[PDB]
Each structure stands twice: as C-alpha cells, then as structure tokens.
Symmetry: D3
Subunit: 266 residues, 6 copies
C-alpha cells in the first residue's frame, strides 16, 4: 500500500529532530517564554496525525526551548479571537483538534516540563502520555484569570488526574500549582529536580521507542478511551470559552496582562 511521504517542513514553528533510537524531539521555540503564536497554534494542533503515520517515529519527546515549556497563547492570538469571527472559528477549530489529535495519536508522547506551562502549552504538557515536571515548574491553566472559560483541555482530563476537588480549586481560582505538588495530587507522572527534567524525560522516551510497539500503543489507545468518552464535555467547554471571548471580562483580562496587573472584573 502506497502512503504519502512525511517531512515536517509543513510545521514551520516547531523544530523536529529524529534520533537514532526513534525518539522525535518536538521543541516549542519562540519569543516570550515560547509563546504560542497564530502559526504555532495551528502547528501544535495538526502535527500529531503526521507523527502517528510516520514509520520512522516510535516515540515523541516534547519540550520548550530554554527554561520554560510554553507561556501560552500570544497577545496577537488573543487579539484575533476577540476581534474577528472567521479567525475565531479557525483558532477554535485548532484548539479542539489539538486535544482530539493528541488523544487519537497512538504514538507514545513524553513531555519535559521545566518552568512555566500555560494554556495551549499546558495542553501539550499534560495530554502527553508521561509528563516529567520540575520541582519549581509553574503549571497554570490561567483562563479564569484571563476572563474566559477553561476550554482548551482541562475539562476532558483534570478530574481524572487529580479528582474533582483539586480540579475545581485550581481551574476556578488559577492559584499556581508547582511541579512538586502537581505530582502529589496526580496531575503529572513524575517530579524530579529541575536540572533532571529533560534527561529524565529523554530516558523515558528512549525506552518507549525500544519497547514492544503494538503493546505500548494499543495499551495507550485503550486507556485513551477514558478521555475520548469525555469528548462532548470537552467540546462543551471549548464552545463556552470562545463564547466568553466576545464578553467584557476578557478585554479587561487582556488589558490586565498587557499592563502586568491583576484583572479587576465587573
């Protein structure tokens, strides 16, 4: 069966390096603590079906360049959502397809969370199969502090990671969750010293690419039915988030981020 070839030239915002072991390193590298621009929002969403169709890739290691995973959506990305209907629908489709595609990717994914992981970056960090978080890594969903509903991933997984009591606490109040406490409540797989996050994650991803592929992938896919069965709930939250982008709270929350202040909502 003839299948089309794979090259990642089509995802320009992401650096992708394939190793001898079969581990694909996907690096989020962009100004402002790896902030997700309009292009990287699409690239992150659409890359996963291509990786899963890649015969050379047996595992994926996702990380941010430098001392940060990703600081979330950029100001231009939030501006376009607020200002343009057709742009908002495009961005909304990408946010939906990011979660759906990571979940429907049978290939194992390991995340190396050092430093902040926010919004669209935290989606990739936590929906990875195995997540390695540093002790002082700041994990912030951040939506309600911005003034919109938390609809980019958390409604599909967080109760099944930490329990409803911890999920509601951090998602409604956006109190910062450090990496050491995140492992304790069950949000991430492992917590190591900050200097050991990438080495620990790299080692995990290496052994997965050298293991039994059908065993690892089919076990992962079966477990992913748990998230898949919460699809309608997630898409309910997605729609609620993008409805709220047309509201008055976000314009205050967006101005609050641009002025480095707390949002005073009314």
């Amino acid at each position: 069966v003839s299948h089309p070839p794979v090259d990642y030239h089509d995802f320009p915002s992401l650096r992708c390096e394939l190793g001898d072991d079969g581990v694909l390193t996907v690096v989020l590298d962009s100004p402002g603590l790896n902030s997700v621009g309009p292009q990287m929002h699409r690239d992150l969403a659409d890359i996963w079906p291509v990786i899963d169709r890649d015969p050379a890739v047996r595992a994926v290691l996702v990380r941010g360049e430098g001392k940060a995973f990703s600081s979330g959506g950029s100001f231009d990305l939030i501006d376009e959502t607020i200002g343009d209907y057709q742009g908002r629908v495009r961005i909304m489709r990408e946010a939906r397809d990011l979660v759906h595609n990571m979940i429907n990717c049978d290939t194992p994914v390991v995340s190396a969370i050092r430093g902040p992981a926010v919004g669209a970056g935290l989606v990739v960090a936590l929906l990875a199969d195995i997540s390695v978080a540093g002790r002082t890594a700041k994990l912030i969903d951040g939506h309600t502090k911005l003034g919109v509903a938390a609809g980019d991933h958390a409604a599909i997984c967080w109760p099944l990671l930490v329990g409803m009591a911890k999920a509601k606490y951090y998602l409604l109040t956006c109190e910062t969750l450090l990496g050491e406490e995140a492992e304790r409540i069950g949000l991430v797989s492992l917590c190591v010293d900050d200097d050991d996050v990438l080495s620990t994650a790299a080692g995990i991803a290496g052994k997965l690419a050298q293991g039994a592929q059908h065993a690892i992938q089919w076990t992962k896919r079966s477990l992913n039915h748990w998230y898949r069965m919460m699809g309608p709930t997630f898409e309910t939250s997605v729609g609620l988030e993008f409805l709220s982008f047309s509201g008055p709270d976000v314009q205050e929350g967006l101005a609050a981020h641009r002025e480095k202040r707390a949002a005073r909502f009314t």
Copy 2:
C-alpha cells in the same frame, strides 16, 4: 426588559442567609444537636440552590455550620419518618435526589467551610461544593453502612472521582472516620488548614470568586460538572437502593444502636 420574579430567602426558614457587600451569600446550618438536619432543613438544603442561581445579587456561596461543627446529618426524627411512612419516605427521597442534582446544576460558585463533623446529608453539602475547606481535626463520615442503609445520598456520584475507587470503596463500606488532614491528601477535599483558620480561609476564597470573571468561573464550573452529571443514573440507583433498605431490619438496629450509645449487632 425580560421580567423575572424577585428573590427573598424567607422560604427557607431553617437556613440563615447573609448577603455581604462582596456578593458572597453565607448559608449557615444552625440547629440543635451539632446542626442536625431535621425534616424542614432537609427540604431547604435541597431547594435553595435553584433560587440562589437565579439571584442577580449573589455571585458566590459560602456554606458552613454554626460553631465548631458543620452538620451531624439527619436527625433521629428524620430517620424515623423515612422508616415509618411511605409518603414521608418518598418526600425525603425526592429531597435527597434533588439536593445532589440542584447543587450540581447550580452554576454559581459554592465554597464550603468544614470545621468539625460532617455526616450524611451534611457531608453531601460539604463535598459537593466547588472548593471545600476542611479543618485538620474535622471528622468526615458518610456513615450509611454503619447506620444500616445503602450509601445513596451523594457518594456514588463523586467519591470515585475524588479519591479513586480503592479509597472510595474502603471508607464508604467500612465508615472508618476520615479526618480532614487525611481527606485532603487523598483528594476528597480541596484544602486542609488549621481548625481556627477554616472560616477565614473559605471566606477569602469565596470573596475572590465573587470578584472574578462571572461567566468564566461559572461556565468552567458547569463544564466540569458534566463529569458528575454523566454519573446521574448511577447516583439515582444508589438513592433507590438506600430507600429500599430503610424498609429492612438492619437499619432498625443501626438506629437503635445510635440512640443507645453502643455498637450495632446486625443479624
């Protein structure tokens, strides 16, 4: 102008309701016997939430018990009516069902301040709140199987999704006392602070929610609540099993053992 009727809480006589300048509605359970839920307070707790959710003046809810106790659960008179009267049993059954379904279907944020014991119908309000603050020495006891009836007033809708099935099955089947400090570690409650700091911590949490982005907080809360809503039929199964067991002989012994300050000897 779409005309909507005004709201006043005189229809809930067993509950003291205080609206603060911040928009937080404080709901206080105050009744004899460590805030025991009598027949009237069972209906009031069940039916107040749809009214609160439609209140333009209310932005957040802080639920607590008066003094050094949240609520000791249903009073002996409430249990006697369930056992003795079919029409009374059906009314209380609807109130137990609607308590859970109305708290979940209330988009307004709810914060609970659990100091002291939280039992049965009282533990329902304490744990179904969005953010729950428990004191270190707060006793959290579902208590149903020790009473002799099925645990069907809330635990089957949430406890597995709070602590995991292994801990859920352990505490619900054995009714071992779960203290507040241990409750937070396994994930049953949101926070654990010193007993003297429970009310101040919860009030501050409820304040910041009433001062936040209303639609953002409420729609995020509603989306998360679908996880409970999808376990609805499972929960209503536990409700019926509970009220079927109230006609059995075991509860008569468990209730008698409670009134007699002894352990229950079931046969």
Copy 3:
C-alpha cells in the same frame, strides 16, 4: 418456596476454598511457580464468582496467595496455548473477559490480602477486590508491555479511576515495579501495612464486613461498581487488542527473554 441449587466449590479444583464461622470465604491461590495460573485456574478464577455470589453461607470473601506470593499470573503453558491454538485462545480470551466482569457483578464484598508479588491475571484479582491490603514491599506489576502484549486483563477498566491517568499510563506502559507503599499513596490499593501484618489486617476487615449490614454493604458496593461497568466496552477493547498481539512477533521475544532471565531486545 423457590428451589435453588446447592453450592459446593468442588467444581473449582485449582482453588482452595475455606468457609469460616465469621462468614468469610477464604479463597487461596496455591500452585507451583509463585502461585502461577495454569489453564485450569484461569477458568476457575473466572467462573467462581457467580457461585459465591449465590452462596447463602458466604457473607464476605478474602482472597490471598499461599506463601510469599499472591500470584505470578498466567503460566507459560497458558501463554503457549494462547499463542498456538485458536480454540484455546478464544477459550482463554473468554475467561479473561469473564474474570473482570464476574468480579464486578459479584455483590458479595471481596477483600484481597496482597503479600508478595502480584502479576497479570493475579493482579486482576488483587486490585478488583473491593478493599485491597498491600504489604509495603509487595511488588505490583501489570507486566504486559514488558512481555510484549497489550495490557488487556483489567487495567483498562480501573487504573485511571484508581491512580489518575498520568500515573496509570506511566506504570502500565513502562512496567516499572510499583511497591505496595507507593501503591497506597497514589490510590491503587486501599491500605498498606507491614508485610507480616497484611493477612491479619485483611482478615479483620473481611470479618467486620461479614458481620455488617449485608444489603447496605452489597448495594453500596454494587452502585460504586457501575463506574467500572460503564467502562466495559473500553475494557473489552483492550482484551481484543491483547489477544491480537499474542499472534505478533514481539511476545515471542519477550517470552524468550523471560525464560532466559534477561532483558528483551524488541525490533
């Protein structure tokens, strides 16, 4: 009267069954190779639960492994029949399905005493029991991906709802040894005690369960079990994937690596 057939466990020769005065049925897994499950014990473990659930003399079940092991899982002859014979693979496949389904549909309370290693089909019984008591140093290993097959004997029905998805995927995909102390902390088991204290602790729990409110405990347990039942199709997906993978090349190497006490070189 309604005539119901009498019950004696002679129909399950691989399992030792002891009925106590407390009402606890002790089910002992005892076989060569750290209580390895041969072809006969694979069926008995699957089919014993409907009969126990219909037993009037049984009020609770205590499962344990004989000696210093709970169970090492399916034996090499069981795996050999799985790889080589279609009718044998279908028979074993039906039993793996019915083991999980029948334990979940057993209303009788089940307590597991996990001292020593519990692997695969043995880990299914240990973790699907209602209350699980694990020793501090007890090795809990699903073991499928290290063997080279999909994890389809129980874990896809419960592990996410026991430890959360992040810990579930880590331990199930990598097969890192999970000790009992860490298993209790993350919520995979109900309790963790010293290894020498596992059996007395479990026996005490099963005793108090058999002397409690039967209908309350069994119906509370049954409602909680709807959480697993609703994931039935997910579990049966993993069952089919596991037995599809037994026909693959990976398991032949993983089996040979286990037989030579070395690490597997998968290609």
Copy 4:
C-alpha cells in the same frame, strides 16, 4: 408538616395557564404572528416547568398553541437581540439550555397538542413532551440551518433517538418540511390524528394520566428521561455552536431572507 411555598403562575405573564377539575394544567401559547416566542415567552417557557413539578394541584400538563397553530418559534425581535447584544445573547442562551433541561427534569407528565406549524423554540416544547399529538397537516420544522445557525435548541438531544440518525440528519440538515402524518411514521411524534381531533385527543390522553398512578407514571417517565439526560453534554455542545454562529454572517442573510419573503443566498 414540611412547609413549602405556594404556587401561582402570575410569574409567567406570556403563558395562559388553566387548571381543570381533573388536575390537568393547560398551558396555552398565545401571541401575535402564529404564537411567536418573544423575549418574555422565551423565559417563561424555560422557567415554568420546575414550578409546575412542585405543584400539588397539578397532575398532568397539556401544552398547545391558540388557534390553528402551535408556535412559529422565536420572533424577529428575539433573533435581533441574540445577534446584537452579548448580554442579551447570553440570557437567551441560558433560557434555551434550561428549557430543554427543565422539561426533561420535570417528572409531571406533559402532553402536547400540535396543530399547525411547530418551529424552533416551539418545536422544542412540542417534541420534548412525553406524548405528542400531531395533526395530519401540521408542519414540523426545526428550521435552524435554513435560518443560518446551528440546530442547537433541542434536536441534538433527542432526534436520533426519535427517528434514527439517517432521518435525523436528513431533516435537520436540509430543513425540509416534515408534515405530521409523516412525522408519526418515522417516530418523531407519538400519534397522528385528523387536524380537527388534535385537541380532543390530547386532552383525553392528559386526563387519563392525571387520573392514573402518580408515582408509577412519574417514575417510569423519569427513568426513560435518563436516555436524554445522558446526552446532556452533547446537547449543550449544540447550544454553544448555535450561539457562536449567531455572530457569523450567514444568519444575517437568513434572517434578512425570512423578513423579505425570499430564499436565502448564502456566500
């Protein structure tokens, strides 16, 4: 005596409510433009059902439109407010969501008498009733995609479970007029009788329900409603998609085409 507040329907000024000697509450939609749902009637239809369900005097509900039409759906002023104001769009969105969820969570039996057109918000009440009686020539039109917005006010919670996905997708995507006689054949409505017999047939059906076993009818109805309740998140997904599309350019054309007595030319 558990004290519960009294019920009077003066809080629903757009709806005429008549309580008969049999216990049937007749709810009449009467408004200009073939009983078009204005801003006030949109809230009233949504919020009346929890009040009816708590009414001891009400044993059954008969919903109908005045004259030879059920309801033509939302008025042009209601659609203009949705498009033009965020706070107005949010209020109407909550009312659309709560209309569906309150009808389903109302245990009291509801019977609909569909003579003439039933459109949009009006078709919601007509089809979510327990037993629906449609005239032969009654036009049943969801109408959303022809208007230019997603079909998110009820059809995603029930239509597949009424007619099957192939017919559900056909009529909802194309908005072809579905007459009452054809609606009954595919299973969208309960009965089809002559147009002149719709009101007499429905009143008799509602009468026999109010004279039947109250808890039997209501608990049977509630159990069946879990089928809808379990599709809750799917329905709320359609609600949000509908109200997101109200900010798009297509609806402006569909609304303009409706006001101009022409076909919509979308680009």
Copy 5:
C-alpha cells in the same frame, strides 16, 4: 479445562428440549396463560448463564405453551413483593438478573410471540435477539396500569427499539400494542400470520445454530453493549418499581386485577 456438567433439572418450571440442529426450545408452561409464579420468576432469571456455558446449545427458541406467550407475574408473586421485605429483595434481584443475564448471554435467542406477552414474559419476548410476533399478539408492559413503575426491562431497551415518542406513549398509558403495529414501530423483528409465528421463529433459530458461531455470537455481544451501557438507567427503574410496590396505588391496582376492573387510583 474441566467444566461442570449441564442439565436443566435445576430449572423445574421450564420445559427444555434440545434438538438435533442444536436449537434449545425453552417453553413457558403454567396455568393462567403461562403466568410467571415465584419459581418461574427465578428460573427465567437464572437459566441463561447455564445455556451460554452449554457446549451442545448453539441457539435458543423461547415460546409459550398454547395460544399465549406469558401473561406476566402471578398474583402470589405480586402478593409476596407487597408483603415481605426479604421476599421483595429476592424477587427484585431476579428481575434485575433476568435482564442482565439475557443481555450477557452470547448464545442467540429467538422468541415466538403468539398471543399475550406481559411483564416478566414480555421481558423474555423482547430481549431475545430476534422476535417473531403474530399479527394479533397483545404486547403489554402493564406496570402503570397495575400501579408501579415500569422497571423490569423497558427502561433499558424501548427507546432504542421504537424511539422515545412511542416508548413513552405505550409505557405511560399501557395502551395495547398489537403485533402488526409493534413491527412497524420497530419493537419486534418480524410479524407473520398468527399460525406462522412458531414455524417462522423455529426456522430462524435453526439457521442460527447451523451458522458461523463465533461470527454470530460476537456480533450479538458487540451490539449488546448498547443495552449494557444503559445498565444504571435500567437499575434506576428497577429500584423505582420496587419502591412503588410499598405504595397505595398497587394495592388498588392489584385489587383491580383480581376483580377484573379498571384501577381507580387516588
């Protein structure tokens, strides 16, 4: 693997005949149009796990003796439910296990519905894989006319057979549904002339026992997940039914049946 032997001496109220083709005929034969007594309520519930474990049985044909499938629960069965808690729990467990066991039986089942099928009999008639109903066969759930919630099967299947509008109509009002109309709305698989119901069903069951067994059974089991996923809803209705047996309506509805009159509920 040694498995215990199978003989149906343990189900005394049911006549079971195994044919050369592999079809097991299970006949409901009892006084009063095959009324379900205390024993037959248990036998119907507990027989299915044994049939499914039977190597000799490849298909099942269920029918009533004479010109009736089954008239439902007997007066003594209803009396015991109303009067005794321990008896009510036993009967309730059987009603639950009847539905669950028929659904969890991989072996194909064909029902021959000629004449009335009520309550516990209609449960067996409609939960069969393929149902053959006569033109004039009366199909009546009958619970709300008796004064109890319809909790013996209908809440697990009826919406997925006829749609919610027809389900609510017949279950809430108990208007008689004849066999010809039942096929039209989709409640039964086939409708033939009354004299052809058993011959048509026998022929269907014969060909199923002579077909591909793993293909037929696994297709049936996968399709049965649809019912299995409505388990909690069904058990909600089961509990509601047996709670209502302690109410005042059933005592009137029971007296109404014993006096051959319509129940005047208050």
Copy 6:
C-alpha cells in the same frame, strides 16, 4: 497569516475525485468486481476524509459507485492478507478503524448515492454518510456472518441507532438481503427513490448543502455525530472481534463457499 499545506487528491490513486463548480467533491469507487476494495483502496477510503475536511474548495462530498454497483466490499486479496499475515492484518485492521472514525470526525457534509449492491467496507461508506439516497432495488448486505466473521466494520456503531435493536440484530446476524425501499422504511437510509433517479437526487442534495450555511450545517452535523463517537469503544470492540475471527476456521469455509457460488456448511 497561518500557512496550511495545499491539497490535491493525487495521494489517493484508487479513488477518482472530481471537484465541481457547486463545491461538491464527487468521490467515485471504480474497480473490477463491482467496485471491489483492494488493498490500496482500503487505505485511501480510510485516510481521504481528514484531507477533504481541510480542503477550502470543498463544501460537500458526494460518494457513488461507478456503474451498477456502489461497492462489493473487501476483495479476496484483501481478505487473504488479513488471514495470512500479522503485519498485514494489523494494517488492514487500523484502516477499518480509521475509516469509521475519520468519516465521523469529518465535519464536511457527505451524501451517498447508493445504486446497486453495497457490501461490507462499501456499505460502511454508504451508511455513514450524512444523507443516504438508496435505490428501491439496491441490495444492502453487511455480509459478515454469512462470510463467517464478526460484523466489525461499522454496524456496531450505528445500526441500533438507525433501525432499532430488533431490526438491527435480525439483519446483521442472518445477512438477509435488505433492499433500499425497506431500508428507508425502517430508517437505515435517509431516502429511497427509483434506481435511475438516485444519482440526480443525491447530486441535488449535495448541491443545496454546498450552497447553504457552512458553519450551521457542519456544526449541526458534528453535534449529531457525538452520538456515534460515544459508541466508539463499542465499535472498536467489534473491530477486534472481527479480526480475531479471521484467524478462525469458519471464515475459510465461508470464503470457499463464496468462491464456489454455493452455501457454506459451517461446523
């Protein structure tokens, strides 16, 4: 701007794709043996839908079979690779899964023009389209149990929600031929027209869909598709069962009986 890769369907050589001015992409299944699906067309049918859904020029999709047949299903060489090779069986198995999943997750409206027989993998495309137009005398046959394997290519995800469980089990277990006229009556297909009128009718529907409100039609379709998605695990269970049964003895006889144009004698 956000740069997105260009789209041309040269990557799917077994499928003819024609783009019209109306915005309809016509996808034609054309191959020997009544449009039999060989190994290449099995992958193309699976993987084409994500690309179509991302195509800016495509507003609707019309699928049809060339000549007097929609599609006869998987070819004998495809079945031969399934029976004989593990890596080939896994590849074909992944494609069968992704065919259903990708059609359901394709927001673009799809209309099928079913003239003549549609069997197995071909029947998947015909019935999973949004609106299906079937000719009166078109033979619709799932065909799996007559072949000797489990029906795991689509029917377990939709047929109960298309025709009801009683008709679903009858046609899927016995493989009795279902003609288009009876298929429309029971709700398996959206429409039934004369055989010579199938293509013009489908083309007209797909045309009017491509000129309608895109976001309204696609989002209405996507919400309705959650009904199927929620049955995903059930569908994937049947997929695994089908490919487990391909290793059994029944299919070898059923395949030989088809090759000799005779009835299969299963043992």
